[PDB]
Design a protein. Structure first.
Lengths: 75, 110, 112, 54
């Protein structure tokens, strides 16, 4: 539909072009795939960090302790 | 009287007995409901105290909460239907879609 | 960075304590969520050896860690504290995991 | 020592958000993702060679 352009170092363009031709795909497709992978990494890291920070917050601990009462439901 | 929950609703849920209440989003489909008390309805707890993240889409007071809250999709769980106290509201379609995408990532779905 | 070392891994079958009374269950949350702490939530699908098999309850074989033919009650999916996972029982055939994923997709109204 | 590769604007925007999230330039980001791609290509190279050699 619409395409744009990103500036890279020529060495990095060569390495990405390798990776694209290794997988049998276009460079555009490769960068789409790798963008989604980076998104997933950032998302899960955001969750991990948020949860560890929330262990200090006792309102969170109370909340999950209350929700843990359901642990045995339907069994 | 047994609650009639529908997917996308925000409900008040009873914990530890059928004292402690917390809001949750019904995310299981309604084709599963058969009117039993112990049947499991899968919900996502809604928290006003956990910090906001991509896997915790926001939930607005127009959707049934008292204060700005987040849907903790990592806490998705089946609960007995008898724990459903009162319908608090309904989530907008954009919120439901964000919950669906969060759940897809959490459970490794393709 | 996620801890994979002592933590349950997705597709594994683990013995879960649902007290406070243990049951096997399939880990279905991704391992990127794990930080190696005890209070974090791991999403599991309880496995039953007494409930009848249905399309939304894919079967689990002794080759995957159960003692007898069982079913994965995907409708019973639930987040549990990582501390309730006591020991690894086995690993599920990839086809079983794909059936669990499709059952969960239908149960949660996910597209499509 | 610098050029331009063409992506969809959607991919560019997602890469931009990831560059901002990591606090680096999109050039440096694409270097990082290049490394990430190569590592998995390394392991897939071993897996394939193992299948061909069995």
């Amino acid at each position: 539909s619409t395409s744009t352009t990103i500036r890279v170092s020529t060495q990095t363009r060569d390495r990405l072009a390798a990776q694209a031709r290794e997988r049998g795909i276009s460079m555009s497709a490769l960068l789409t795939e790798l963008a989604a992978q980076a998104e997933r990494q950032a998302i899960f890291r955001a969750e991990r960090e948020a949860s560890h920070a929330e262990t200090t917050t006792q309102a969170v601990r109370d909340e999950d302790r209350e929700w843990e009462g359901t642990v045995g439901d339907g069994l | 009287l047994m609650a009639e929950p529908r997917r996308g609703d925000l409900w008040l849920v009873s914990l530890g007995a059928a004292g402690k209440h917390r809001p949750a989003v019904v995310v299981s489909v309604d084709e599963l409901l058969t009117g039993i008390d112990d049947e499991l309805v899968v919900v996502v707890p809604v928290s006003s105290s956990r910090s906001r993240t991509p896997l915790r889409p926001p939930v607005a007071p127009s959707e049934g909460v008292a204060a700005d809250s987040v849907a903790v999709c990592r806490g998705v769980r089946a609960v007995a239907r008898a724990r459903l106290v009162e319908r608090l509201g309904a989530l907008k379609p954009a919120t439901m879609r964000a919950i669906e995408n969060a759940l897809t990532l959490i459970l490794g779905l393709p």
